[PDB]
Write a protein that binds this ligand. Structure first.
Ligand SMILES: Nc1nc2c(ncn2[C@@H]2O[C@H](COP(=O)(O)OP(=O)(O)OP(=O)(O)O)[C@@H](O)[C@H]2O)c(=O)[nH]1
Ligand SMILES: Nc1ncnc2c1ncn2[C@@H]1O[C@H](COP(=O)(O)OP(=O)(O)CP(=O)(O)O)[C@@H](O)[C@H]1O
Ligand SMILES: COc1cc([C@@H]2c3cc4c(cc3[C@@H](O)[C@H]3COC(=O)[C@H]23)OCO4)cc(OC)c1O
Ligand SMILES: Nc1nc2c(ncn2[C@@H]2O[C@H](COP(=O)(O)OP(=O)(O)O)[C@@H](O)[C@H]2O)c(=O)[nH]1
Ligand SMILES: [Ca+2]
Ligand SMILES: [Mg+2]
Ligand SMILES: [Mg+2]
Lengths: 54, 437, 334, 427
C-alpha cells in the first residue's frame, strides 16, 4: 500500500513498499592451529617410519 | 566510489567466475582485450563500473579479481581462454596438487603453504583501492579447495581486513553432479569455520540449477557450462546494484542491512525468473505480474524448499528490463492475497524494490533467450534451513560409523572438529526454528 | 517394482495399507532409514518433509500434508476459522469458540458470556462441561496446556428409541491433485446412555467417544450405527434422507475447510507430493443443522470399513501416481 | 600428475606387458613409440603414464622387475617390447622358485636396491608424482615376495604418495604350486598395511568366466589375460583421458575407502568376450548395466549378494545416451537398495568416456568395494590352514630364515580383515 523512499535515476529507480508494520580469532591463534595440525602429521609420519624401521 | 574485490576459490569458483566476468564484460560493453570504448575517462575515474574494474593508462579495464586453485588445470584455461588479456598473471594463482576432495588437506596441509602468497596477491589489489568495501568469495561446499582453503582465507581476511565486509556465493552439493562422497563432511566443516567470518552468503543448490536447466532450457544433461551461465545471470542480478547507478544495495554493508537482521542467519534464498530457452521458436513475453508471481514458485528457487512453511525476515526484488513501480505494486497486491507470506512479528511486511531499465544481457550463442523483463527475489526465509537439515542428516549417517574420517585425521585435523562443527550446525538449525515457528 | 517405508507402527489404517501393497507383488518394503523410496508412510510428529523430493530418479510421495496441522489442532482450527475471510467469524456451521491460555482472547470470551446470561438463554460451554465460566477458567489453569472454550450444543438431535446422543465421523481422502474424495461410508459413534439435560457432571451421555462408551452394544453393535440404518431411521422418524438433511452440509463443510488451506499446503508444483486421510467429526442439532466439531489428521477407521477404505486409498492416492501393470468415493468438485 | 608403473614376476610382467599393449593402441602409440592417432583426446592426459622424448616419442613410465630373465626376455621380443626404456629392465638370475621368502628376504633383497634406483630416476622427472601402480601375483615368489618388499620400501621413501596394485589371487583351478596359499596370505598381510588401493584379480573368477560363460573348454593364461587387460584398461580410463570428472589415485582412495584397511576392490567388466571372436551386436545400456553388476562378470570369485557395497565406481565407454546411463544406474540402486549401505549416502558414482576400447562399440567397467570380498580371503585362509595345521611344505621357508610365528601373524591379520568386512555387512 504505502510506497516510500522513491529514488529515480537514468539507469532505473528503486523504492520500498510496506504492506503491514511489525508487531574473531587472531593471527596468533590461527598460526597456532595450522602448526598444531602440522605437528600431528609429523608425529604420524614418524610412527610410520619408526614402524618401517622395525 | 568504493571498490569490490572478487575472489574465486576452487574449480566451482573459478569456472563460475569465468561465467560472471564474461557476462559483466558484455553488460558494460568491455571487450576481451579489456578496452571499453564508452569509457571517456581514460586511465581512471570513479564510475559505478569501476567498483569491479580498475583502469590502466593504456585504457585497459581489468577485473578487481583473483583466481586461486590448488590445481593448475582449471585456471590454465583462463590463462589461455578468450579473456586471457583481461587478467594479468599476478591475479591467477595455481598450486601443484589439489586437496583431493579433502577439507583438511585444503585447509591445513596445502592451505598453509600458499595462504601467505594469496593474501599478498590480494593485498596488491587492495593497495589500488581508494575505499575498499570488502570481498565477494565464490566457491563450493563439496570441494577440498572450495571448502578447505576458503575457510582459511576467510579467517585471515577478518584479521587483515577487520572493517571490511565479506559476501559469499556458495555452491551447495548435489548428487546429480557430485564429485565426491564426502562432500557433506566438507560442507559442514567449512560452514562452521566460515560462519562468523561471513556477512551474507548466497547458497546455490546444483540440484535446483540442474532441474531448471532441464525443465526450462530443455537440456537433457546440463553441463557445468549450462549451470554456470545460468548462475552468472543470478550473480549479475545481485551485483548489478554495485556496478550501476542506483540507490538500493549500493554497497556491501547494505546487503547485511536489508537482508540479514540476525548475524548467524545470513543465508538469503534467491529466486530467479523467467528462464527461457534460446532455441524456443515461439515465446510469449511474460509480464511484471507473471515473473513476480514466479518468485514464489519453489521450482524457480536456487534452493529447493517451501517458504510457505517458514517466516520471512526480509525480501528484496531486483528487476531488469521494462518495469515500472506501478506494475510492481499491482503485482505484489495480487500475489499477497493468493500466496502464504508470513513475516516474523519483529519485522515489517514489505519489499525493497530495485529496477534497472537495461534488460538482462545474454551470452551470444548461449542457452538463454533475450527477455524484455526479468527479476531476482532475495528473500531471507527460514525455509532455507531445510537444506541444512538435509545436509546435516547425510553428515550424521556417515559420521556415526566414522567413515572416511581417517583421511581427515591423517592430514593433521582432529576427530573433535567434526563434532565441533556439527554442534554449531545443530545450533544453527535451532536458531532457524526459534525464528520460524 | 516400487518401494515404500513405514515410520508409524501404531497406524492401524496404514498397517493395512502396507499389507495390501506387499500383496500386489509390485511393492517392496524397505527399512525405516532407507532414503531410496517411492512412498513414505511417515510418523505423526517431526515428519521430515525437508528431506523429501531430493532423490534423483525417484518420484516421492508421502501420506501427509505439511501444514495440515493448522486444521487438525483445536487451537489452530479456531484461529484458522476466525482469521480466514473464506470462513470468517460469520460462518454458521462452526460453534462459537475462543482460544484461552493458562496464566489469548479471554476478555473477548467473557463479553459473549454476558449476553448469554443477560439474555437468559442457553449458556453452557465445553473445554469439561459447565454453565459457569469460573468453573472452566479454574480448570484450564490447573491442567497446563492450551485449551479451547466452545459453545456446547444444548439441543442435540436425539436418536430413538433411547433418547441418545451421537456424533458423525466422515473419512475424507485428498490426493496429490488435491481432489477431495469423501468416503461414501461414514459412521455414527452413538451414546448408549440417554442424554441428560440437567446434569452435566455425568460425561457418559454427553461425550460420545468410542472408548468412553466402552449399555455398550445395546442398540447396535459397538455403539456404531452405519449410514444405511441411520438413513432408514430418518426416513421413518422424520420423513427425510441422510443425503438431504445432513450430508449436503457435511459435503459443504469439508469442501470449505480444505479449499481454505489449499494454497498453503498444496503440493502441485513441489518437488515431492502429498496425500492424506482426514476424519471430520460432525454434530447434528434437533433442527437437523450440522456443526463441525473437529478434524483428525491421523484418523482410525471402523472395523467393518477398513478393508474397503484402505483398498480405496491404494487405488486413488497411490496407484494414481504409481500405476500397476464403481468408486467408493464421492468427488467434492471445486 | 604422473604415475610410475611397476611389474614384478612372471605374472606381473605378462599382464603388465599386455596392459601397455592395450592402452598404447587406445592412445594411438605404436611399438616404435610414435603417435599416429586422429583425436586430441588421446594426448591430453597421456603424460600420466608416458614420458615424452625429443621427436615426440612417448615412452612408458614403467619399470620391469623379475628375479629371472625368462619372462622379461619374452616381453622385450613381444609386440610392444621395444617401446620400454631399456634401462628400466632390472633383473636377476636365480629366480625365486615360487618362494615368498626368497623374493622378500634373501634373493629379492639382493636386487631391490637396484629397482629403487630406477624408481627414483623416474620420480625425479615427474612434475608432480601422484603415486605408483604395481602389477604382480601373490601366489608366486618374485611378484608376491619381492613385490611386497618393494612396496614397503617405496612407502619408506615416498610415504606421502599413493600405492595402487593389481594383485592376481591364486586358485587351485589355475595352480602352479601347492604353496600358493602361503605366498598369498603373506602378501595380503603386506597389502593391508602398505597399499591404499588393491584391485583383487582372482584367477578362480577368470577361469570360471572363460569356462562357464565364454565356453572355452581349456583356458590358458592368455585367455585369462584378455580379461585382465580389458579390466586394467577400463579402470584406468578416467586416469588416462579427459572428461567431466578427471580421476587421480588420491581422489580414488578418498572416495572408495571408508576405512584404511578395507581397500580391496572387486573389478567387473561387460561385455565379456573371448579372444579373436568378434561381436557384431552392440549392447544396449540396460544390458551393460545388468551385466556389469552380475556375479558372472566379476573378476573376483565373490557373490555380491552375500555382502553389501560400501562404494561403487562405474565407467561407461563409447558413444551413448549419458541420460540413459544415468537412469539405468539409478534404477539398479533403487531396485536393489538393500545391497548398498545406507550409512554412506550416494555411494555410486558414474562416468562416461567417448573413446571405446578396441573391438567394442561400447563397454562398462565396474569397481566395487564390497564386503563380499571376504569370501575371497576366507577361501585363501582355508587353503592356508589345511596345510599349516600340519606345518606342510614349511621347510621351504624356514630354510630361508623365516619362523612359524610369522605365518601365524599373517594368518591372524587376514582373518581380522575378514571379520572387519563382516562387521560392516551387518551395520
Ligand atoms: N555449478 C557448478 N558446480 C561445480 C562446478 N565445478 C564443480 N562444481 C561442484 O563443486 C563440488 C566439488 O568441489 P570442486 O570445486 O569441484 O573441487 P575444488 O574446489 O577444486 O577442491 P579440490 O577437491 O581440491 O579439487 C561438486 O559438488 C560439484 O558439483 C561448476 O563449474 N559449476
Ligand atoms: N461443542 C460441543 N457441543 C456438543 N458436543 C461436543 C462439543 N464439543 C465436543 N462435543 C462432544 O465431544 C465429544 C468428544 O470430543 P471430540 O469428538 O472432539 O474428541 P477428541 O477426543 O476431543 C476428538 P476424536 O476422539 O475424534 O480424536 C464429541 O465426540 C462429542 O461427543
Ligand atoms: C580412475 O578410477 C576412477 C576413480 C573415481 C573416484 C570416485 C569413486 C567413488 C565415488 C566418488 C569419486 C570422485 O571423488 C572421483 C573424482 O575423481 C576420482 O578418482 C574419484 O563414490 C563411490 O566411489 C571415479 C571413477 O569414475 C566414476 C573412476 O573411473
Ligand atoms: N592371470 C595370470 N596369472 C598368472 C600368470 N602367470 C602366473 N600366474 C599366477 O601366479 C602364480 C604364480 O606366480 P608367478 O608369477 O609365476 O611367480 P613369480 O614369477 O616368481 O613372481 C600362480 O598362482 C599363477 O596362477 C599369468 O600370465 N596370468
Ligand atoms: Ca574510466
Ligand atoms: Mg579441483
Ligand atoms: Mg610361474
Amino acid at each position: 500500500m504505502e510506497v516510500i523512499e522513491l529514488n529515480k535515476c537514468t539507469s532505473g529507480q528503486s523504492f520500498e513498499v510496506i504492506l503491514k508494520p511489525p508487531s574473531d580469532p587472531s593471527l596468533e591463534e590461527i598460526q597456532k592451529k595450522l602448526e598444531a595440525a602440522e605437528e600431528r602429521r609429523k608425529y604420524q609420519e614418524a610412527e610410520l617410519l619408526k614402524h618401517l624401521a622395525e | 566510489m568504493r571498490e569490490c574485490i572478487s575472489i574465486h576459490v576452487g574449480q566451482a569458483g573459478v569456472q563460475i567466475g569465468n561465467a560472471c566476468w564474461e557476462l559483466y564484460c558484455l553488460e558494460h560493453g568491455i571487450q576481451p582485450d579489456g578496452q571499453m570504448p564508452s569509457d571517456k575517462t581514460i586511465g581512471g575515474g570513479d564510475d559505478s563500473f569501476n567498483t569491479f574494474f580498475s583502469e590502466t593508462g593504456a585504457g585497459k579495464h581489468v577485473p578487481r579479481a583473483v583466481f586461486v586453485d590448488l590445481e593448475p588445470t582449471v585456471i590454465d584455461e583462463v590463462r589461455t581462454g578468450t579473456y586471457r588479456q583481461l587478467f594479468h598473471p599476478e591475479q591467477l594463482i595455481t598450486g601443484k596438487e589439489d586437496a583431493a576432495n579433502n577439507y583438511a588437506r585444503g585447509h591445513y596441509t596445502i592451505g598453509k603453504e600458499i595462504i601467505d602468497l594469496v593474501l599478498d596477491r590480494i593485498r596488491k589489489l587492495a593497495d589500488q583501492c581508494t575505499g575498499l568495501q570488502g570481498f565477494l568469495v565464490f566457491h563450493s561446499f563439496g570441494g577440498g579447495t572450495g571448502s578447505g582453503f576458503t575457510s582459511l582465507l576467510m579467517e585471515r581476511l577478518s584479521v587483515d581486513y577487520g572493517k571490511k565486509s565479506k559476501l559469499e556465493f556458495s555452491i551447495y552439493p548435489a548428487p546429480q553432479v557430485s564429485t565426491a562422497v564426502v562432500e557433506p563432511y566438507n560442507s559442514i566443516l567449512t560452514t562452521h569455520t566460515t560462519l562468523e567470518h561471513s556477512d551474507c552468503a548466497f547458497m546455490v543448490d546444483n540440484e535446483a540449477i540442474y532441474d531448471i536447466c532441464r525443465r526450462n532450457l530443455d537440456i537433457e544433461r546440463p553441463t557445468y557450462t549450462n549451470l554456470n551461465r545460468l548462475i552468472s545471470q543470478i550473480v549479475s542480478s545481485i551485483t548489478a546494484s554495485l556496478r550501476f547507478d542506483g540507490a538500493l544495495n549500493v554497497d556491501l554493508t547494505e546487503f547485511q542491512t536489508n537482508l540479514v537482521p540476525y548475524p548467524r542467519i545470513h543465508f538469503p534464498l534467491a529466486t530467479y525468473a523467467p528462464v527461457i530457452s534460446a532455441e524456443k521458436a515461439y515465446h510469449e513475453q511474460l509480464s511484471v505480474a507473471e515473473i513476480t508471481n514466479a518468485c514464489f514458485e519453489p521450482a524457480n528457487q536456487m534452493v529447493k524448499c517451501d517458504p510457505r512453511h517458514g517466516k520471512y525476515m526480509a525480501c528484496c526484488l531486483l528487476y531488469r528490463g521494462d518495469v515500472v513501480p506501478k506494475d510492481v505494486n499491482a503485482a505484489i497486491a495480487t500475489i499477497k492475497t493468493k500466496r502464504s507470506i508470513q513475516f516474523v512479528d519483529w519485522c515489517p511486511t514489505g519489499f525493497k524494490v530495485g529496477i534497472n531499465y537495461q534488460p538482462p544481457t545474454v551470452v551470444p550463442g548461449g542457452d538463454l533467450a533475450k527477455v524484455q523483463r526479468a527479476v531476482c527475489m532475495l528473500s531471507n526465509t527460514t525455509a532455507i534451513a531445510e537444506a541444512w537439515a538435509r545436509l546435516d542428516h547425510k553428515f550424521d549417517l556417515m559420521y556415526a560409523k566414522r567413515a572416511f574420517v581417517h583421511w581427515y585425521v591423517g592430514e593433521g585435523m582432529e576427530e573433535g572438529e567434526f563434532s565441533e562443527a556439527r554442534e554449531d550446525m545443530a545450533a544453527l538449525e535451532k536458531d532457524y526454528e526459534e525464528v520460524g515457528v | 517394482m516400487y518401494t515404500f517405508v513405514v515410520r508409524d507402527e501404531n497406524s492401524s489404517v496404514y498397517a493395512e495399507v502396507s499389507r495390501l501393497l506387499l500383496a500386489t507383488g509390485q511393492w517392496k518394503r524397505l527399512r525405516k532409514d532407507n532414503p531410496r523410496f517411492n512412498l513414505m508412510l511417515g510418523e505423526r510428529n517431526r515428519l521430515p518433509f525437508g528431506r523429501l523430493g531430493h532423490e534423483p530418479g525417484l518420484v516421492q510421495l508421502v501420506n501427509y500434508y505439511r501444514g495440515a496441522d493448522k486444521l487438525c489442532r483445536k487451537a489452530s482450527l479456531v484461529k484458522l476459522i476466525k482469521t480466514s475471510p473464506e470462513l470468517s467469524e460469520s460462518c454458521t456451521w462452526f460453534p462459537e469458540s475462543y482460544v484461552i491460555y493458562p496464566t489469548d482472547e479471554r476478555e473477548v470470551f467473557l463479553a459473549a458470556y454476558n449476553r448469554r446470561r443477560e439474555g437468559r438463554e442457553g449458556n453452557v460451554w465445553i473445554a469439561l462441561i459447565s454453565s459457569e465460566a469460573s468453573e472452566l477458567l479454574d480448570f484450564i489453569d490447573e491442567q497446563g496446556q492450551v485449551h479451547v472454550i466452545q459453545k456446547y450444543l444444548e439441543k442435540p438431535l436425539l436418536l430413538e428409541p433411547g433418547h441418545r446422543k451421537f456424533d458423525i465421523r466422515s473419512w475424507v481422502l485428498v490426493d496429490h491433485l488435491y481432489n477431495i474424495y469423501l468416503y461414501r461410508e461414514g459412521v455414527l459413534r452413538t451414546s448408549s446412555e440417554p442424554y441428560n439435560s440437567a446434569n452435566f457432571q455425568d460425561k457418559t451421555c454427553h461425550l460420545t467417544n468410542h472408548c468412553i462408551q466402552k449399555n455398550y452394544g445395546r442398540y447396535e453393535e459397538g455403539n456404531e450405527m452405519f449410514f444405511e440404518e441411520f438413513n432408514q431411521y430418518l426416513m421413518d422418524a422424520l420423513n427425510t434422507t441422510l443425503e438431504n438433511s445432513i450430508l449436503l452440509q457435511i459435503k459443504h463443510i469439508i469442501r470449505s475447510c480444505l479449499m481454505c488451506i489449499e494454497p498453503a499446503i498444496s503440493t502441485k508444483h513441489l518437488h515431492y507430493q502429498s496425500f492424506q486421510l482426514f476424519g471430520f467429526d460432525f454434530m447434528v442439532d434437533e433442527e437437523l443443522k450440522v456443526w463441525l466439531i473437529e478434524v483428525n489428521g491421523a484418523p482410525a477407521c471402523a472395523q467393518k470399513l477398513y478393508a474397503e477404505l484402505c483398498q480405496g486409498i491404494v487405488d486413488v492416492a497411490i496407484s494414481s501416481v504409481f500405476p500397476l501393470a464403481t468408486s467408493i468415493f464421492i468427488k467434492l468438485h471445486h | 600428475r604422473e604415475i610410475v608403473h611397476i611389474q614384478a614376476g612372471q605374472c606381473g610382467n605378462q599382464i603388465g606387458a599386455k596392459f601397455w599393449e592395450v592402452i598404447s593402441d587406445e592412445h594411438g602409440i605404436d611399438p616404435t613409440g610414435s603417435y599416429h592417432g586422429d583425436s586430441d583426446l588421446q594426448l591430453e592426459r597421456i603424460n600420466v603414464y608416458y614420458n615424452e622424448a625429443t621427436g615426440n616419442k612417448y615412452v612408458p613410465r614403467a619399470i620391469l622387475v623379475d628375479l629371472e630373465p625368462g619372462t622379461m626376455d619374452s616381453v622385450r621380443s613381444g609386440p610392444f617390447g621395444q617401446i620400454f626404456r631399456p634401462d628400466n629392465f632390472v633383473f636377476g638370475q636365480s629366480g625365486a622358485g615360487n618362494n615368498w621368502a626368497k623374493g622378500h628376504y634373501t634373493e629379492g633383497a639382493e636386487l631391490v636396491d637396484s629397482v629403487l634406483d630406477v624408481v627414483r630416476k623416474e620420480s625425479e622427472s615427474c612434475d608432480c608424482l601422484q603415486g605408483f601402480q604395481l602389477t604382480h601375483s601373490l601366489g608366486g615368489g618374485t611378484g608376491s615376495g619381492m613385490g611386497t618388499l618393494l612396496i614397503s620400501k617405496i612407502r619408506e621413501e615416498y610415504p606421502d604418495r599413493i600405492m595402487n596394485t593389481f594383485s592376481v589371487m591364486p586358485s587351485p583351478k589355475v595352480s602352479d604350486t601347492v604353496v600358493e596359499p602361503y605366498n598369498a596370505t603373506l602378501s595380503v598381510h603386506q597389502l593391508v598395511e602398505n597399499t591404499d588401493e588393491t584391485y583383487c584379480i582372482d584367477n578362480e573368477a577368470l577361469y570360471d568366466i572363460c569356462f562357464r560363460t565364454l565356453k572355452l573348454t581349456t583356458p590358458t593364461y592368455g585367455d585369462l589375460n584378455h580379461l585382465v587387460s580389458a579390466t586394467m584398461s577400463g579402470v584406468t580410463t578416467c586416469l588416462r583421458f579427459p572428461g567431466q570428472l578427471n580421476a587421480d589415485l588420491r581422489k580414488l582412495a578418498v572416495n572408495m575407502v571408508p576405512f584404511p584397511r578395507l581397500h580391496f576392490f572387486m573389478p567387473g567388466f561387460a561385455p565379456l568376450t573371448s579372444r579373436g571372436s568378434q561381436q557384431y551386436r552392440a549392447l544396449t545400456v540396460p544390458e551393460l548395466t545388468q551385466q556389469m553388476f552380475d556375479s558372472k562378470n566379476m573378476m573376483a570369485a565373490c557373490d555380491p549378494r552375500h555382502g553389501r557395497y560400501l562404494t561403487v565406481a562405474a565407467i561407461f565407454r563409447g558413444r551413448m545416451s549419458m541420460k540413459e546411463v544415468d537412469e539405468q544406474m539409478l534404477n539398479v540402486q533403487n531396485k536393489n537398495s538393500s545391497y548398498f549401505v545406507e550409512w554412506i549416502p550416494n555411494n555410486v558414482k558414474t562416468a562416461v568416456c567417448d573413446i571405446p576400447p578396441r573391438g567394442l562399440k561400447m563397454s562398462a567397467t565396474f569397481i566395487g568395494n564390497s564386503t563380499a570380498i571376504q569370501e575371497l580371503f576366507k577361501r585363501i585362509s582355508e587353503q592356508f590352514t589345511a596345510m599349516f595345521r600340519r606345518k606342510a611344505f614349511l621347510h621351504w621357508y624356514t630354510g630361508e630364515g623365516m619362523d612359524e610365528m610369522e605365518f601365524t601373524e599373517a594368518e591372524s591379520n587376514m582373518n581380522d580383515l575378514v571379520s572387519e568386512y563382516q562387521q560392516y555387512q551387518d551395520a
